Scaffold this active site. Structure first.
Site, PDB file in Angstrom:
ATOM      1  N   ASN A 287     165.062  -7.108  21.510  1.00  0.00           N
ATOM      2  CA  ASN A 287     163.733  -6.726  22.083  1.00  0.00           C
ATOM      3  C   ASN A 287     162.678  -6.650  20.989  1.00  0.00           C
ATOM      4  O   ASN A 287     162.071  -5.603  20.734  1.00  0.00           O
ATOM      5  CB  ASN A 287     163.791  -5.409  22.879  1.00  0.00           C
ATOM      6  CG  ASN A 287     164.179  -5.606  24.340  1.00  0.00           C
ATOM      7  OD1 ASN A 287     164.333  -6.735  24.813  1.00  0.00           O
ATOM      8  ND2 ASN A 287     164.338  -4.497  25.061  1.00  0.00           N
ATOM      9  N   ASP A 318     160.787 -11.034  26.030  1.00  0.00           N
ATOM     10  CA  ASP A 318     160.927 -10.674  27.448  1.00  0.00           C
ATOM     11  C   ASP A 318     159.633 -11.082  28.131  1.00  0.00           C
ATOM     12  O   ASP A 318     158.595 -10.461  27.903  1.00  0.00           O
ATOM     13  CB  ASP A 318     161.141  -9.169  27.643  1.00  0.00           C
ATOM     14  CG  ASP A 318     162.520  -8.693  27.217  1.00  0.00           C
ATOM     15  OD1 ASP A 318     163.337  -9.493  26.711  1.00  0.00           O
ATOM     16  OD2 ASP A 318     162.785  -7.485  27.391  1.00  0.00           O
ATOM     17  N   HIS A 333     158.497  -4.755  27.921  1.00  0.00           N
ATOM     18  CA  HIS A 333     159.736  -4.278  28.522  1.00  0.00           C
ATOM     19  C   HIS A 333     159.437  -3.875  29.961  1.00  0.00           C
ATOM     20  O   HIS A 333     158.780  -2.860  30.222  1.00  0.00           O
ATOM     21  CB  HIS A 333     160.333  -3.128  27.705  1.00  0.00           C
ATOM     22  CG  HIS A 333     161.769  -2.843  28.017  1.00  0.00           C
ATOM     23  ND1 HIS A 333     162.447  -1.773  27.474  1.00  0.00           N
ATOM     24  CD2 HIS A 333     162.655  -3.479  28.821  1.00  0.00           C
ATOM     25  CE1 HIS A 333     163.690  -1.765  27.923  1.00  0.00           C
ATOM     26  NE2 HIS A 333     163.842  -2.787  28.745  1.00  0.00           N
ATOM     27  N   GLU A 367     164.083 -13.866  27.764  1.00  0.00           N
ATOM     28  CA  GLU A 367     164.524 -13.159  28.955  1.00  0.00           C
ATOM     29  C   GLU A 367     163.397 -13.346  29.953  1.00  0.00           C
ATOM     30  O   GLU A 367     162.360 -12.690  29.865  1.00  0.00           O
ATOM     31  CB  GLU A 367     164.762 -11.683  28.652  1.00  0.00           C
ATOM     32  CG  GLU A 367     165.469 -10.945  29.770  1.00  0.00           C
ATOM     33  CD  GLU A 367     165.357  -9.451  29.618  1.00  0.00           C
ATOM     34  OE1 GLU A 367     165.924  -8.897  28.646  1.00  0.00           O
ATOM     35  OE2 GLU A 367     164.692  -8.834  30.467  1.00  0.00           O
TER      36      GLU A 367
HETATM   37 CA   LIG Z   1     165.190  -7.823  26.692  1.00  0.00          CA
END
Ligand SMILES: [Ca+2]
Length: 708
Positions: A287, A318, A333, A367
């Site tokens: 992340n 992400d 996130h 992601e």
């Molecule tokens: Ca992630």
């Protein structure tokens, strides 16, 4: 790595700060030894920055831009065909990835900043710069003392007190012992403080009777005996190190570059880089966009720059749709309170920093939650246009995407960026379960043609079983697991996991309950041959301390060749169950923690903790010295037996941790060193910060011994 003459001669800049709107003319220099980047103002004042504190340098469009109207007017930024971008230089410094300072300069001459950026970073990033001998770090102190002068060109006595703050009375006594003034408001001629006088000062402040104990005066014969027996031409060493061999001469010899705790060749790029990509441990970030916690806090594209500059080779994006009325893809996130950045900004950051410090390929773990053909098309176009020739848009001719074909090597993919993306939940209880484990990784959406076309060697698919993966025999398929799922697999199907990793990639990432961005310990996953063991780079806890330390080696390329038995198909390996063949080069390591020097900026009791990371069957005892005899932190001496690590089974996979603490377990400094990089004998172990940056003041004196 010699400092180029122009750097020491200096160049004219205007240094500026947005928060103060102050713009001041300076001459910028690097000292001839390469210890400090420093600038001198017109009023003669100087400011210093440790070369070792520098994280990046940036020129032109990549430099910081003045935001205040006050500074924009000074630099003529509201003008047609201005030359401002030919004049901008930024030096980025800081103790870790997040706590950054930007030192901003605008040159008078055009184009000069490019050379300054490149040459300064080259000095900072050389694998050996941080790994100098104790003597060099001690010299760094001397240089600072002699350069930071008052109006009369003298060294204020108060600067000695500031440099060595733990015990003023002892500093005063050491000055007096050198026939130097010790008055609070006195000053010293730098001519009266050359290296030999500095050495005498150190011997007075920090006596070393534990070294005097090795003398059981030395001649040629006796010193040759010492080097050949203990440390595993001699007259030349006496001539170099003897002040008048005396006890003091031995101190300086043992602090010198002829004695290195590391086999320094191992810090350089030296691994075979021609094996399949999945035959390496690959430095990996989780992340990446997050600067702090997982549930709240700032997201920043600067994180991508920082991790890539430390040789991280796998980062995470992400991706989410813009929040209406916004229609531009963002990174954040999902389903948390973390801030958002534009997808575009991340790509720009990655493109800038990707190959500045390592030429070896990077993997972008997408992601993807962008369930919009339009916004996915924007994503794909950003990648293609911004990365340009760096982006691997199709497989290599030699390595088709067919069963039985191995992955290309890091060398085959030099300077390439690889995209990992898919290629062509509802109730409270289900939400809580997902949040606790895989998190938003359980919510990815379908890829359309534009994004799908960018995927080749790193194709994510849902894991079925090791048997299924082996049957399909596709090296270009990656499996991703939380620490929890991978632990279940490595505990119950160890051999199969290792075998899987001989053919394919696995990526491991932290479980969702770690909302404070804590990290799991990576060793158990590396032990199973897992390549991308992804950690939160913003959290310099023990896992990241180990990660930074082990990936410093092999040129900080971000790649480490796995053990032979984690690579070759004809030797089955189980990290939980070693056999006779596995343990052929097993070794027993002994480390004696003897003493420490200048361990803390204050007088406090200290101790040293020592442990080994390695295989399940490797020695698990964690050693601690007693607390130091007193609050003396200048030169504590412990009375310890050797700490023995019996039968380190496969030393290539193991690392030794040596950590120095204040009473209460407050971190002072550490080293984590791969076993195969250690030299035997008496050494001065220079200590690093949590983020593996070299500390100037604190060191340990140790004795290392290894036997078959
Ligand atoms: Ca992630």
């Amino acid at each position: 790595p010699k400092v180029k003459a122009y750097l020491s001669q200096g160049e004219r800049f205007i240094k500026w700060d947005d928060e103060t709107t102050v713009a001041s003319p300076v001459i910028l220099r690097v000292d001839p030894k390469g210890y400090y980047l420093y600038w001198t103002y017109q009023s003669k004042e100087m400011e210093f920055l440790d070369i070792t504190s520098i994280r990046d340098t940036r020129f032109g469009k990549f430099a910081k831009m003045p935001k205040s109207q006050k500074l924009r007017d000074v630099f003529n930024m509201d003008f047609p065909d201005n030359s401002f971008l030919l004049k901008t230089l930024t030096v980025v410094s800081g103790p870790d990835m997040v706590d950054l300072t930007f030192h901003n300069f605008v040159s008078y001459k055009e184009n000069v900043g490019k050379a300054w950026a490149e040459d300064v970073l080259a000095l900072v990033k050389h694998p050996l710069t941080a790994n100098a001998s104790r003597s060099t770090f001690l010299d760094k102190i001397l240089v600072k003392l002699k350069m930071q002068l008052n109006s009369e060109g003298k060294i204020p006595v108060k600067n000695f007190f500031q440099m060595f703050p733990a015990d003023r009375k002892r500093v005063e006594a050491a000055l007096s012992a050198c026939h130097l003034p010790k008055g609070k408001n006195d000053a010293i001629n730098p001519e009266d403080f050359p290296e030999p006088v500095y050495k005498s000062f150190l011997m007075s402040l920090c006596p070393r009777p534990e070294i005097d104990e090795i003398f059981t005066y030395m001649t040629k014969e006796h010193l040759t005996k010492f080097i050949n027996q203990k440390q595993r031409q001699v007259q030349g060493l006496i001539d170099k190190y003897e002040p008048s061999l005396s006890p003091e001469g031995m101190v300086w010899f043992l602090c010198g570059p002829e004695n290195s705790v590391l086999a320094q060749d191992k810090l350089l790029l030296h691994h075979d880089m021609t094996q399949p990509l999945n035959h390496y441990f690959i430095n990996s970030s989780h992340n990446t966009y997050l600067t702090a916690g997982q549930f709240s806090g700032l997201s920043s594209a600067e994180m991508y720059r920082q991790v890539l500059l430390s040789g991280c080779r796998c980062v995470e994006l992400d991706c989410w749709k813009g929040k209406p009325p916004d229609e531009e893809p963002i990174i954040t996130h999902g389903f948390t309170m973390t801030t958002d950045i534009f997808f575009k900004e991340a790509i720009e950051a990655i493109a800038e920093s990707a190959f500045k410090t390592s030429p070896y390929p990077i993997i972008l773990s997408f992601e993807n939650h962008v369930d919009s053909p339009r916004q996915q098309a924007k994503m794909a176009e950003y990648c293609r246009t911004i990365f340009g020739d760096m982006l691997l848009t199709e497989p290599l001719e030699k390595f088709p995407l067919k069963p039985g074909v191995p992955l290309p090597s890091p060398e085959d993919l030099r300077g390439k960026i690889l995209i990992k993306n898919k290629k062509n939940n509802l109730d409270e209880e289900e939400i809580k379960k997902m949040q606790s484990d895989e998190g938003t990784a359980g919510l990815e959406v379908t890829a359309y043609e534009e994004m799908s076309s960018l995927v080749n060697y790193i194709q994510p698919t849902k894991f079925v079983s090791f048997e299924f993966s082996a049957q399909k025999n596709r090296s270009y398929v990656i499996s991703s697991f939380t620490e929890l799922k991978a632990y279940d697999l490595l505990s119950k199907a160890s051999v199969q996991f290792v075998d899987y990793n001989k053919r394919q990639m696995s990526r491991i990432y932290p479980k969702g309950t770690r909302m404070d961005s804590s990290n799991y310990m990576p060793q158990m996953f590396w032990n199973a041959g897992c390549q991308m063991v992804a950690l939160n780079f913003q959290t310099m806890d023990l896992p990241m301390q180990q990660n930074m330390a082990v990936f410093e080696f092999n040129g900080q390329s971000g790649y480490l060749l796995k053990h032979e038995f984690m690579r070759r198909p004809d030797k089955q390996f189980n990290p939980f169950s070693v056999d006779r063949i596995d343990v052929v080069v097993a070794t027993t390591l002994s480390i004696t923690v003897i003493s420490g020097q200048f361990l803390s900026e204050r007088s406090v009791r200290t101790y040293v903790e020592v442990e080994l990371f390695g295989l399940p069957g490797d020695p698990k005892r964690r050693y601690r010295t007693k607390l130091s005899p007193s609050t003396n932190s200048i030169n504590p001496v412990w009375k310890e037996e050797p700490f023995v690590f019996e039968k380190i089974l496969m030393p290539e996979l193991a690392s030794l941790r040596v950590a120095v603490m204040e009473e209460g377990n407050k971190f002072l400094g550490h080293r984590i060193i791969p076993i195969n990089a250690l030299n035997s004998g008496y050494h001065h172990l220079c200590l690093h910060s949590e983020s593996n940056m070299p500390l100037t003041m604190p060191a340990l004196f140790i004795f290392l011994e290894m036997k078959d």
